[PDB]
Structures are given as C-alpha cells and as structure tokens.
Design a protein around this ligand. Structure first.
Ligand SMILES: CC(C)CCC[C@@H](C)CCC[C@@H](C)CCC[C@@H](C)CCCC(=O)OC[C@@H](O)[C@@H](O)CO
Ligand SMILES: CC(C)CCC[C@@H](C)CCC[C@@H](C)CCC[C@@H](C)CCCC(=O)OC[C@@H](O)[C@@H](O)CO
Ligand SMILES: CC(C)CCC[C@@H](C)[C@H]1CC[C@H]2[C@@H]3CC=C4C[C@@H](O)CC[C@]4(C)[C@H]3CC[C@]12C
Ligand SMILES: CC(C)CCC[C@@H](C)[C@H]1CC[C@H]2[C@@H]3CC=C4C[C@@H](O)CC[C@]4(C)[C@H]3CC[C@]12C
Ligand SMILES: CC(C)CCC[C@@H](C)[C@H]1CC[C@H]2[C@@H]3CC=C4C[C@@H](O)CC[C@]4(C)[C@H]3CC[C@]12C
Ligand SMILES: Nc1nc(NCCc2ccc(O)cc2)nc2nc(-c3ccco3)nn12
Ligand SMILES: CCCCCCCCCCCCCCCCCC
Ligand SMILES: CCCCCCCCCCCCCCCCCC
Ligand SMILES: CCCCCCCCCCCCCCCCCC
Ligand SMILES: CCCCCCCCCCCCCCC
Ligand SMILES: CCCCCCCCCCCCCCC
Ligand SMILES: CCCCCCCCCCCCCCC
Ligand SMILES: CCCCCCCCCCCCCCC
Ligand SMILES: CCCCCCCCCCCCCCC
Ligand SMILES: CCCCCCCCCCCCCCC
Ligand SMILES: CCCCCCCCCCCCC
Ligand SMILES: CCCCCCCCCCCCC
Ligand SMILES: CCCCCCCCCCCCC
Ligand SMILES: CCCCCCCCCCCC
Ligand SMILES: CCCCCCCCCCC
Ligand SMILES: CCCCCCCCCC
Ligand SMILES: CCCCCCCC
Ligand SMILES: CCCCCCCC
Ligand SMILES: CCCCCCCC
Ligand SMILES: CCCCCC
Ligand code: NA
Length: 390
C-alpha cells in the first residue's frame, strides 16, 4: 500500500486550510456585530455564540482531529477529551441554531411581547447555560461511557504505548452506542427535527398573517361596492358593520392611528345615518372612505406586507444555515449508523471517514458566506471592515 504519510499530508493540508478560513470568516462575523449597533440584537447574540463555536473548531477541534488521526499513545481520559471536544462545539452549535429558530418564532407570533420577553440579559443567561450543557453532553464519555476499560492490546503493543495508555483512535475509545443513540438520535436529530417544525410554524404564521391582511383589505373594498349599488338602509347598514369589524382587525405610528381614526369615524358617521333610514346620505358618507383608504390604510397594508416579507426572507436565510449544518454533519452520523447497526457490513473505508470528517469541519466556514450573501446589514458591514481595515 502507498505510504500512509502521503494520504496523511493531504488530510492535514485540507484540515489546516479549513481551520484558517473558519477562523477568519467567523472573526469577521464577531467584528461586524461589535462595530455595528444595528447588528446588536438578541438574534445576533446567538449568531456570535455560533461564530465562537466555529472559531474554536479552527483553533482547537481541527488540531485535535489532526492529533487523533495519528493514533498517538495517550492516557485514555486525555484521548477521550481530544476525541470528544468537537462534540461540545457541535452541541453548542445545535443550541444556538435552536435558540435562533425559537427567537424568530416569538418575533413573528407575539411581536408586541417580543422585546420584553426576549432581552439581552435573558439571552446572555441562555447562552451561558447552553455552553455548560454542551460540555456535559459532549464530554459524557469522560464520565464512564467509554471503551477505556476494554483497550485494544494489539494496537497498544504495536504502537508501543506505556501503561495506562491507549492508541488514541476515535472508534476504539468512544462507544458507537453513545455516538448513535445519545449523540445522533437524542442530541442532534431530535433538535434538527424540532428546528424544522419551528421554521414550518414561522412560514405558516407569516402566510396566515398575510392572508388575514389581504382578506381585511378585500372585505373593505367589496363592502364599499355593496354600499354603492345598494337600494336601502339595511343593505348599507349590513355592509358598513362588516367594514367596521374588518377595520378594527386590520388596526391590531401617530399618522397610522390618525388614519384608522378617520376610517372608523367615517364608518360610524355613515352607520348613524343608516339607522335613521337616510340611505343616500349614508351612501355619500361611505364614498368618503375611499380617500381615507387610498391616503392612510393602503400605506399601513403595504408596510405590514413588506415587514412580513422581510421576516420570511430572514427566516429563509436562517433555515439555510440549519440545512447546511445538516448537510455537513449527517454523513458522519449515517456512517456511524452503518458501523453500529450493520456488523456484517464492511466498515466505511478510511478515505471516506476522513472525507466525512473534513466535510463536518467545512461547516465552520460556510455561515459567514450565508450572512454576506443573504443579509444586507452583514454584507455592508463586512464591506466597511474590509475597505477601512484591509
Ligand atoms: C490551526 C491554525 C490555523 C491555528 C491554530 C492556533 C493555535 C493556538 C493551535 C493550538 C494547538 C494546540 C492546542 C495543540 C495541542 C496538541 C496536543 C493535543 C498534542 C498532543 C501530543 C502529545 O501528547 O504528544 C504525543 C506523545 O506525548 C504520546 O505519544 C505519549 O504520551
Ligand atoms: C460545505 C459544502 C457546500 C462544500 C464543502 C466541500 C467538501 C466536499 C470538502 C472538499 C475536500 C475534498 C475534495 C478533499 C479531501 C480529501 C481527503 C479527505 C483525503 C483523505 C485521505 C486519507 O485517507 O488520509 C488519511 C489516511 O490516509 C491516514 O493516513 C490517516 O491520516
Ligand atoms: C488555552 C488552550 C489553548 C488550552 C489547550 C490545552 C490542551 C491542548 C490540553 C488540555 C488537556 C491536555 C491533555 C491532557 C492529557 C493528555 C494525556 C497524555 O497521555 C497525552 C496528552 C494529553 C492528551 C493532553 C493533550 C493536551 C491537552 C488536550
Ligand atoms: C446527507 C447527504 C449528503 C447524503 C449522504 C449519504 C452518505 C453518508 C451515504 C451514501 C451511500 C452510503 C454508503 C453505502 C455503502 C456502504 C458500504 C457499507 O459496507 C459501509 C457503509 C457505506 C460506505 C455507506 C455509508 C454512508 C453513505 C456514503
Ligand atoms: C435524514 C434524517 C431525517 C433521517 C436519518 C435516517 C437514518 C437514521 C437512516 C437512513 C438510512 C438508514 C440505514 C439504511 C440501511 C441500513 C442497513 C441495515 O443493515 C442496518 C440499518 C441501516 C444502517 C440504516 C440505519 C438508519 C439509517 C442510517
Ligand atoms: N466514527 C468516527 N471516527 C472518527 N475518526 C476515526 C476514523 C477511523 C475509523 C476507523 C479506523 O480504523 C480508523 C479511523 N471520527 C469521528 N467523528 C465522528 C463524529 C462526530 C460527530 C458525529 O460523528 N465519528 N467519527
Ligand atoms: C499547509 C502547510 C504545510 C502542510 C503540512 C505538511 C504535512 C506533512 C506532515 C506529515 C506528518 C505525519 C505524521 C504521522 C502521520 C501518520 C498517521 C497514520
Ligand atoms: C458566556 C461565556 C461562556 C461560558 C463557558 C464556560 C464553560 C465552563 C466549563 C463547563 C463545565 C461543565 C463540566 C461538565 C463536564 C465535566 C467532564 C469532566
Ligand atoms: C438535506 C438538506 C440540505 C439542503 C441544502 C439547503 C441549502 C440551499 C442552498 C441555496 C441558497 C444558498 C445561498 C448561498 C450558497 C453559498 C454556499 C457556500
Ligand atoms: C478545501 C477548503 C474547502 C473550502 C470550501 C468552502 C466553500 C465556501 C463557498 C464559497 C463560494 C464562493 C463563490 C464566489 C463567487
Ligand atoms: C499559545 C498556544 C501555543 C500552543 C503551542 C503548542 C504546540 C504543540 C506542539 C506539540 C508537540 C508535541 C511533541 C510530541 C513529542
Ligand atoms: C450558568 C449556571 C449553571 C447552569 C446549570 C445547568 C443546569 C443543569 C441541570 C441538569 C443537567 C443535565 C446534564 C445532562 C448530563
Ligand atoms: C473518571 C473522571 C470523571 C470526572 C467527573 C467529575 C465531574 C462530575 C461531573 C459534574 C457535571 C455537572 C455539570 C452540570 C450539568
Ligand atoms: C428517522 C428514523 C430513525 C429510525 C432508524 C432506526 C433504524 C434501526 C435499524 C435496526 C437494524 C437492526 C439490525 C439487526 C439485524
Ligand atoms: C461525503 C458523502 C458522499 C460520499 C459519496 C461517495 C459514495 C461512494 C460510496 C462507496 C463506498 C463503498 C466502499 C465499500 C467497500
Ligand atoms: C458584542 C460582540 C462581542 C463579540 C464576542 C467575541 C467572542 C470571541 C470568543 C472566541 C473564542 C474562541 C477561542
Ligand atoms: C454578545 C453576547 C454573547 C457572548 C457569546 C460568547 C461565547 C463564548 C464562549 C467561548 C467558549 C469557547 C471554548
Ligand atoms: C491525568 C491525565 C489525563 C487527564 C485528562 C485531563 C483532561 C481535562 C483537563 C483539561 C482542562 C480543560 C481546559
Ligand atoms: C499550527 C497548528 C498545527 C497543528 C498541531 C499539530 C499537532 C500534531 C501532533 C502529532 C502527535 C504526535
Ligand atoms: C482577522 C480579521 C479579519 C480579516 C478579513 C479578511 C478576509 C476574510 C475572508 C473570509 C473567509
Ligand atoms: C434552549 C434554547 C431556547 C432559547 C429560547 C430563546 C429565548 C427565550 C427567552 C424567554
Ligand atoms: C434533516 C432535517 C433538517 C432540515 C432542516 C432544514 C430547514 C429547511
Ligand atoms: C431496535 C434496536 C436493536 C438493534 C441493536 C443493534 C446493535 C448492533
Ligand atoms: C477525493 C476522493 C478520495 C479517493 C477515492 C479512492 C481512493 C482509494
Ligand atoms: C507546519 C505544521 C505542520 C503540521 C504537523 C505535522
Ligand atoms: Na458549528
């Protein structure tokens, strides 16, 4: 067989290339949030926590991955730390992505409550807690769910390790039942499915809010035409009562309020006329509503549509991040599933293991590109930093 060092050199070179790009791109994310007060919101606190996890992939996880690829002699608990530390960073990533999804869900479902439910101070506490939980989940093998008690004596003696030491190889020390049931099913797949469910609920909420606006609009316009071609007070009365309901629903910022005050007032004026049986004076009064609609209501309608469209576009941007996370991490998990559940199956070849590892690391490069391409405030701030400071 080809000398192992040849394939190792290609692996190490690619890992270091990923490390540099993971560090530089994610430092730029953090720098941008620092510089630009417009990026300093709770959602971006989770973005920075995720960027920190991706920097730590370049600074620590990749060097650990290079180290463990050599099968060097190590005390089994030191070996476990090096093997498992990336699981902490990946778990931290999952918690940040989950927090972002829920943050955007609260923002679209209860916008008025959002700013007092979701504060900076609560976000900082949630981020600290998520990082502690990530250490506990990812280093669970150090608490005794490990293969340190069943060492590979053949490998130990062939590598010439001293006593207490193992040839530090991931699949020799980390149990595959931990990797498949606990890490993959419980800690990764379940949160990814929850995130899918939350984004689905975001898109369903946006669409139902957009449909309700458009229906309120149409209720207004249709009742305006019912009133015109009407033939008695009871017709005009019914249509006006519908419009009034629709108008109070649409309402649920001074120039905004003035607009709906004019509209509802005009409706109520045309409502009192109708009740007195004055059909033509009611109908005339209702013709006033058209200029109020054109001048105030159509403006609020279009601002509300535009806001919802921006929230959908932002939610799409953030969901793409979750999909690339899944794309980058699932192959390694699926390989572990084959290793674990198919003992009759040939183990995935080494080159495929290392490709899946490298792909998982590439996840720590991509998010800065998604922010630059999809989010104007990031793109513009990256431009300022690159021009001014490079
Ligand atoms: C990647 C680059 C773009 C940026 C990196 C930045 C800097 C700070 C990286 C820091 C790297 C260190 C944290 C790496 C630690 C390396 C350790 C894990 C090596 C362990 C090897 C060891 O213990 O020696 C082997 C023998 O002692 C053993 O066989 C017998 O005990
Ligand atoms: C994020 C996505 C949109 C794009 C990501 C791009 C992905 C596909 C990364 C591209 C890199 C690869 C084309 C090149 C990697 C080749 C590596 C994995 C070869 C490994 C060879 C190998 O087996 O080396 C290790 C062993 O030989 C042994 O020596 C132990 O070190
Ligand atoms: C501030 C940052 C850079 C600190 C980084 C500290 C890291 C590199 C330290 C902390 C714990 C250390 C490990 C502790 C125990 C062992 C077992 C020994 O048999 C081989 C070395 C090994 C595997 C060490 C490698 C280096 C290590 C992982
Ligand atoms: C998430 C997207 C990108 C899909 C990726 C699916 C990947 C992980 C799938 C596609 C085909 C799969 C391989 C098909 C056949 C075998 C041979 C078996 O003896 C070991 C596992 C192995 C080598 C599988 C491992 C996982 C595999 C490489
Ligand atoms: C993508 C997300 C949503 C779903 C994850 C699907 C995973 C868990 C599925 C996809 C393909 C599946 C594998 C397909 C084939 C085999 C070979 C069989 O002898 C043991 C089970 C095993 C190894 C399956 C395990 C579970 C598996 C890896
Ligand atoms: N199975 C596995 N192996 C490794 N590295 C060892 C690759 C290998 C596998 C077998 C072998 O004989 C020599 C090397 N890193 C790994 N990282 C992960 C991982 C992280 C998150 C999910 O899976 N799984 N995983
Ligand atoms: C991109 C900067 C330079 C790239 C590094 C060159 C890679 C050569 C290092 C080889 C060291 C091999 C150590 C033992 C590996 C054997 C694993 C089975
Ligand atoms: C907001 C700042 C980030 C806070 C990070 C602090 C994390 C400290 C380490 C966590 C301790 C948990 C220990 C559980 C694992 C023990 C296994 C030996
Ligand atoms: C298994 C689900 C994975 C699906 C991937 C979703 C991503 C869609 C990509 C379209 C938008 C990408 C924007 C910029 C791409 C830059 C990539 C480096
Ligand atoms: C071997 C290092 C892998 C780095 C791959 C990361 C891909 C990032 C996407 C960049 C696309 C840039 C397109 C510009 C037009
Ligand atoms: C401020 C962080 C600097 C870290 C420098 C440490 C480099 C580690 C090199 C390990 C060499 C191991 C030799 C084994 C015989
Ligand atoms: C920053 C204050 C410390 C956070 C306390 C975390 C609460 C942990 C409760 C249950 C731990 C379950 C860990 C799973 C192994
Ligand atoms: C054989 C070495 C195992 C060392 C474990 C000692 C530390 C206890 C773990 C407490 C974790 C609490 C974190 C909060 C969830
Ligand atoms: C998202 C679906 C998750 C369910 C996957 C469970 C697969 C279990 C495979 C059992 C294989 C047992 C092999 C015995 C011969
Ligand atoms: C990085 C995930 C996609 C990898 C696509 C490669 C598919 C080839 C799999 C064949 C491996 C068969 C070897 C078993 C003997
Ligand atoms: C309000 C913006 C502050 C930016 C926080 C920067 C955190 C960087 C920590 C990275 C840790 C990697 C070793
Ligand atoms: C703007 C407040 C967010 C602070 C997030 C910083 C996270 C740093 C954790 C570093 C742990 C790396 C090992
Ligand atoms: C006594 C030799 C093996 C013990 C492993 C210690 C690993 C955990 C300590 C690292 C500290 C984290 C910063
Ligand atoms: C600058 C970062 C380089 C990565 C550190 C390499 C550590 C390999 C140690 C080999 C174990 C014997
Ligand atoms: C370390 C400061 C940031 C420098 C930015 C240079 C370009 C970053 C490229 C993103 C992969
Ligand atoms: C576990 C991650 C959930 C974080 C939720 C986001 C903010 C909620 C504060 C009330
Ligand atoms: C593999 C399931 C998670 C995918 C989430 C992507 C959201 C569009
Ligand atoms: C339904 C799970 C039982 C199969 C266990 C497979 C472990 C090799
Ligand atoms: C990048 C592809 C890896 C090499 C495939 C076959 C090596 C035996
Ligand atoms: C210059 C870094 C070399 C990688 C370790 C063999
Ligand atoms: Na990450």
């Amino acid at each position: 067989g080809a000398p192992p060092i040849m394939g190792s050199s290609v692996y190490i070179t690619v890992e270091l290339a990923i490390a540099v790009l993971a560090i530089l791109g994610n430092v730029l994310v953090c720098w941008a949030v620092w510089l630009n007060s417009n990026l300093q919101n709770v959602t971006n606190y989770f973005v920075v926590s995720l960027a920190a996890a991706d920097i730590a992939v370049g600074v620590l996880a990749i060097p650990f991955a290079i180290t463990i690829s050599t099968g060097f002699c190590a005390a089994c608990h030191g070996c476990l730390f090096i093997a498992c530390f990336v699981l902490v960073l990946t778990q931290s990533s999952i918690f940040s992505l989950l927090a972002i999804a829920i943050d955007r869900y609260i923002a679209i479902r209860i916008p008025l409550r959002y700013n007092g439910l979701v504060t900076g101070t609560r976000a900082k506490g949630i981020i600290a807690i998520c990082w502690v939980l990530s250490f506990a989940i990812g280093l669970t093998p150090m608490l005794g769910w490990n293969n340190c008690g069943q060492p590979k004596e053949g490998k130990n003696h062939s590598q010439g390790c001293g006593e207490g030491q193992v040839a530090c190889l991931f699949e020799d020390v980390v149990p595959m039942n931990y990797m498949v049931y606990f890490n993959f099913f419980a800690c990764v797949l379940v949160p990814l499915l929850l995130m899918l469910g939350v984004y689905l609920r975001i898109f369903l909420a946006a669409r139902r809010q957009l449909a309700d606006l458009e229906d309120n609009w149409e209720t207004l316009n249709d009742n305006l035409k019912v009133i015109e071609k009407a033939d008695n007070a009871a017709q005009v009365k019914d249509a006006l009562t519908k419009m009034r309901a629709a108008a109070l629903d649409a309402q649920k910022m001074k120039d905004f309020r003035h607009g709906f005050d004019i509209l509802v007032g005009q409706i109520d004026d045309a409502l009192k006329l109708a009740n007195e049986g004055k059909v033509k004076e009611a109908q005339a009064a209702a013709e006033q509503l058209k200029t109020t609609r054109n001048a105030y209501i159509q403006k609020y309608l279009e601002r509300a549509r535009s806001t919802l469209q921006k929230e959908v576009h932002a939610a799409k941007s953030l969901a793409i991040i979750v999909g690339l996370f899944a794309l980058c991490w699932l192959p390694l998990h699926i390989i572990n599933c084959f290793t674990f559940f198919c003992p009759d199956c040939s183990h995935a070849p080494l080159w495929l293991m290392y490709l899946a590892i490298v792909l998982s690391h590439t996840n720590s490069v991509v998010n800065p590109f998604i922010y630059a391409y999809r989010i104007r405030e990031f793109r513009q701030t990256f431009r300022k930093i690159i021009r001014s400071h490079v």
